[PDB]
């Protein structure tokens, strides 16, 4: 896969550009980040509007026919209607994913992590890839797959961020003369950070969780005013979402909906915890880690079954259809065979099914389905004690853990968070019901509290991120002292989950061969210096060379490198492939400046598409004006936690290794920091 530079070339044309602008560009970055925030908020609000409306239109068919047959007979026509509606919406929303572009599958997070880490997965930022995924989640959550829409907002934020930063649409083949300074990929990597952070803050309503998400990946030096612009974009995105949802719901000046999911507020004082139940919270994290390991192992062998055998696109479409049909029949087995009814009190169902009940009561398993999963997650956090049948939650949890697991690796744009939080609030609630059975209904056996800790338990178990997940769960709940049990639970669940299998997102990274970088060394490798790591032959140039050597180096037809040093064997600089391509086009053997090096900045033209082999490829070549004069340089006896620290924290992609005297041996290029 393709790398991504982050350090600028610092060539003398960029110094000329520094002198020309320094006779007012930072002010552009603020309004670009503000637009990224506004657009991500509007996309989140548009998804909320259309997913509420279509699923609201969908169940009024299904309730209006289950209630039609239940006094005569013949529910099999209603079940076939409900399976046909689910399979139809999932067919429409998945045929655009397997055939058109196979990269919008699942949440964006396994691609956004690798992009912030610098791997250009070959379709991440594309207007087509956006509108597949924006219209995929709408046609998939309404399809009745057991998924949650809060997941794939990070990719929408990143796509919109890298799109509107450039003043150019390559998908429309038109241009603008607006933001010529920002086609340079030092900047473009940092705008994707702002878009992902704003996608997080518009997802879960926790705007530091965006910041300490997008600071975790892209683990670079503390670029301060970048970080402050990221927090700026995060706050604007959550305010735009809250404002438009509160003018759509009525009561314009009651900004009550911060994110897509809203956990409530925990100032009810039955939710209050003290020290005498702190080692209970360690026990929930162990169970969360165990069930997350079971989840990830089942999904892992499922994907190992799916890559080798189901790789034709139409097979994948038939697979995605024949899960939504099975899901509705499983749900209707559970609803049709349920033997408990509870009447309505306030808004708790909004599509109640008086299936077999006593005409004022309603089917409780029908209430656990037939909802947005957001409403069930919020209800489990805040329903009063004594408001659930434990058999009901047991059946719902036990089927839902597999339906969450079986529906992850499919070719649908969807998340995993609200499935993970719904499982975690599901089995966590049972642990708070049984403690009201042993303690004789004490006050610290509050089952609305133990649903909250099970949610963070399962979510830390399945995906192993902390400090981007502790910060959200502090800030969505809006109770500050809840971070301490959540910190304990997340530490516990990550440690107990790492002794079985890796994290789900790192799993789906490594199952498709990404040259990815972790936070540190593999284990230690302090003895393993830079001697054993560098590549032994060096394909290097000279400043007093002849073109034709350029043609043979760029047309190796066996290697396809992108970084080339230049020496006299004394190291002078590091010339890229793409800059050397642009030097090959125009007559070099004066007018060349930085805008000539931003001509169609992604996807430059390859070497076969330039015929310069008759008069050119026979004379000299000057790249003394066109070179990075101070590339970062380690000696070969540098230990690996000094080599990996300099490489990862700067966003380098070619780290030249130079011995005692200035002579070049080897050039570390990111594959040999992933193989260890």
């Amino acid at each position: 896969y393709e790398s991504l530079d982050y350090d600028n070339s610092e060539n003398q044309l960029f110094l000329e550009e520094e002198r020309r602008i320094n006779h007012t560009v930072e002010i552009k970055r603020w309004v670009i980040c503000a637009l990224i925030g506004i657009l991500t908020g509007l996309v989140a609000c548009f998804i909320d509007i259309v997913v509420e409306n279509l699923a609201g239109l969908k169940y009024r068919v299904i309730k209006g026919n289950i209630d039609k047959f239940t006094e005569k007979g013949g529910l099999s026509f209603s079940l076939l209607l409900w399976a046909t509606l689910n399979a139809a919406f999932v067919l429409v929303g998945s045929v655009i994913v397997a055939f058109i572009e196979p990269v919008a599958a699942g949440s964006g997070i396994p691609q956004i992590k690798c992009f912030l880490n610098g791997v250009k997965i070959p379709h991440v930022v594309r207007l087509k890839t956006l509108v597949i995924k924006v219209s995929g989640v709408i046609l998939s959550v309404v399809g009745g797959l057991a998924v949650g829409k809060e997941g794939p907002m990070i990719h929408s934020g990143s796509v919109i961020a890298a799109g509107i930063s450039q003043g150019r649409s390559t998908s429309l083949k038109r241009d603008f003369k607006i933001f010529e300074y920002f086609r340079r990929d030092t900047e473009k990597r940092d705008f994707v950070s702002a878009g992902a952070a704003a996608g997080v803050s518009a997802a879960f309503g926790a705007p530091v969780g965006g910041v300490l998400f997008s600071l975790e990946e892209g683990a670079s030096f503390w670029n301060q005013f970048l970080t402050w612009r990221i927090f700026f974009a995060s706050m604007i995105s959550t305010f735009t979402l809250n404002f438009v949802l509160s003018i759509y719901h009525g009561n314009m000046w009651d900004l009550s909906s911060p994110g897509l999911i809203n956990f409530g507020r925990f100032d009810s004082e039955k939710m209050a915890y003290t020290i005498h139940e702190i080692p209970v919270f360690i026990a929930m994290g162990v169970v969360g880690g165990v069930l997350g390991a079971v989840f990830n192992a089942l999904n892992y062998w499922l994907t190992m079954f799916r890559i080798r055998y189901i790789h034709r696109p139409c097979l994948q479409v038939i697979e995605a259809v024949l899960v939504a049909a099975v899901t509705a029949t499983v749900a209707f087995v559970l609803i049709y065979s349920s033997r408990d009814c509870q009447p309505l009190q306030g808004g708790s169902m909004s599509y109640p099914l008086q299936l077999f009940c006593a005409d004022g009561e309603y089917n409780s398993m029908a209430a656990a389905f037939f909802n947005t999963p957001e409403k069930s997650v919020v209800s489990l956090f805040h329903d009063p004690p004594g408001s659930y049948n434990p058999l009901t939650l047991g059946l719902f949890t036990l089927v839902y853990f597999f339906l969450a697991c079986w529906t992850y690796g499919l070719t649908v744009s969807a998340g995993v968070f609200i499935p993970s939080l719904l499982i975690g609030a599901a089995w966590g609630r049972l642990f708070g019901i049984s403690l009201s059975y042993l303690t004789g209904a004490a006050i610290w056996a509050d089952p609305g509290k133990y649903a909250l800790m099970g949610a963070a338990a399962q979510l830390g178990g399945i995906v192993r991120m902390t400090l981007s997940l502790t910060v959200i769960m502090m800030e969505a709940t809006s109770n500050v002292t809840y971070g301490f049990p959540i910190m304990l639970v997340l530490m516990t669940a990550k440690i107990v989950g790492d002794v079985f299998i890796e994290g789900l997102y790192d799993m789906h990274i490594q199952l498709q061969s990404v040259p990815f970088l972790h936070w540190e060394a593999p284990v230690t490798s302090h003895s393993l210096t830079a001697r054993e790591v560098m590549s032994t032959p060096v394909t290097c140039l000279r400043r007093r060379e002849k073109v034709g050597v350029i043609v043979d180096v760029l047309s190796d037809t066996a290697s396809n490198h992108n970084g080339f040093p230049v020496v006299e064997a004394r190291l002078q600089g590091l010339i890229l492939r793409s800059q050397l391509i642009v030097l090959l086009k125009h007559k070099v053997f004066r007018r060349l400046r930085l805008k000539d090096f931003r001509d169609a900045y992604p996807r430059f033209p390859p070497i076969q598409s330039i015929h310069v082999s008759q008069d050119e490829r026979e004379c000299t070549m000057d790249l003394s004006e066109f070179m990075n004069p101070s590339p970062y340089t380690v000696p070969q006896e540098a230990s690996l936690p000094r080599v990996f620290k300099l490489f990862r924290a700067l966003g380098l992609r070619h780290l030249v290794v130079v011995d005692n005297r200035n002579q070049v041996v080897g050039l570390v290029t990111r594959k040999d920091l992933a193989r260890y």
Partner: protein, 207 residues
């Protein structure tokens, strides 16, 4: 000969306090005498309105009301608004609390007819059968009014009447349609749960 409101009250508004008290004590008699047979909104919808009119006569405004920290009259009237706006007695009222609505008294008259149909057919052989029409037309009118509500809960009288009807129809009768409908749904359920293993095996074998 002390200045007014400091030793006692003036007799000029003490009469207003006294006949507010005489009237307001009767409303408790409505609420508790007409409590478990829940005839609430149709009994003291006159007695509640005259309390509101006596709130207007005492509105000696700052002399009575806003001269104490435990405002007896104000928290009593706030309790009457609270009891009023949870029973939703306006749904029993017509337009401006003059009289009842025709829909609700139509419902109550049909309700007493339904109870007479319950009483005449009195071993629930001919009780479940040959009485189901009254329960269906009464629940039909209930769901009709309940759907009528939302463009504009309900009155506590009609809602507790329908609670009586549903509790009677559900238990001590068990007038329940058996609805033998199991075998087709089981056939379709096994028919669809067996499709994925067919798909997985036909994917594995075509190899």
């Amino acid at each position: 000969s002390l200045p007014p409101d400091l030793p006692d009250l003036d007799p000029e508004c003490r009469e207003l306090l006294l006949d507010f008290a005489n009237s307001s004590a009767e409303l408790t008699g409505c609420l508790v005498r007409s409590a478990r047979p829940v005839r609430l909104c149709q009994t003291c919808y006159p007695l509640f309105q005259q309390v509101v009119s006596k709130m207007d006569n005492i509105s000696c405004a700052r002399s009575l009301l806003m001269a104490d920290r435990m405002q007896i009259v104000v928290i009593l009237s706030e309790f009457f608004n609270t009891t009023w706006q949870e029973a939703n007695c306006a749904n029993c009222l017509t337009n401006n609390s003059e009289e009842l609505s025709n829909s609700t008294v139509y419902f109550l008259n049909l309700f007493n007819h339904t109870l007479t149909c319950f009483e005449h057919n009195l071993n629930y052989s001919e009780v479940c059968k040959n009485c189901r029409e009254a329960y269906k037309t009464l629940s039909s009118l209930y769901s009709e009014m309940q759907k009528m509500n939302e463009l504009e809960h309900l009155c506590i009288d009609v809602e507790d009447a329908m609670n009586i009807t549903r509790k009677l129809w559900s238990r001590t009768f068990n007038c329940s349609v058996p609805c033998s409908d199991t075998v087709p749904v089981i056939a379709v359920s096994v028919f669809i749960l067996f499709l994925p293993v067919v798909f997985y095996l036909s994917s594995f074998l075509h190899s």
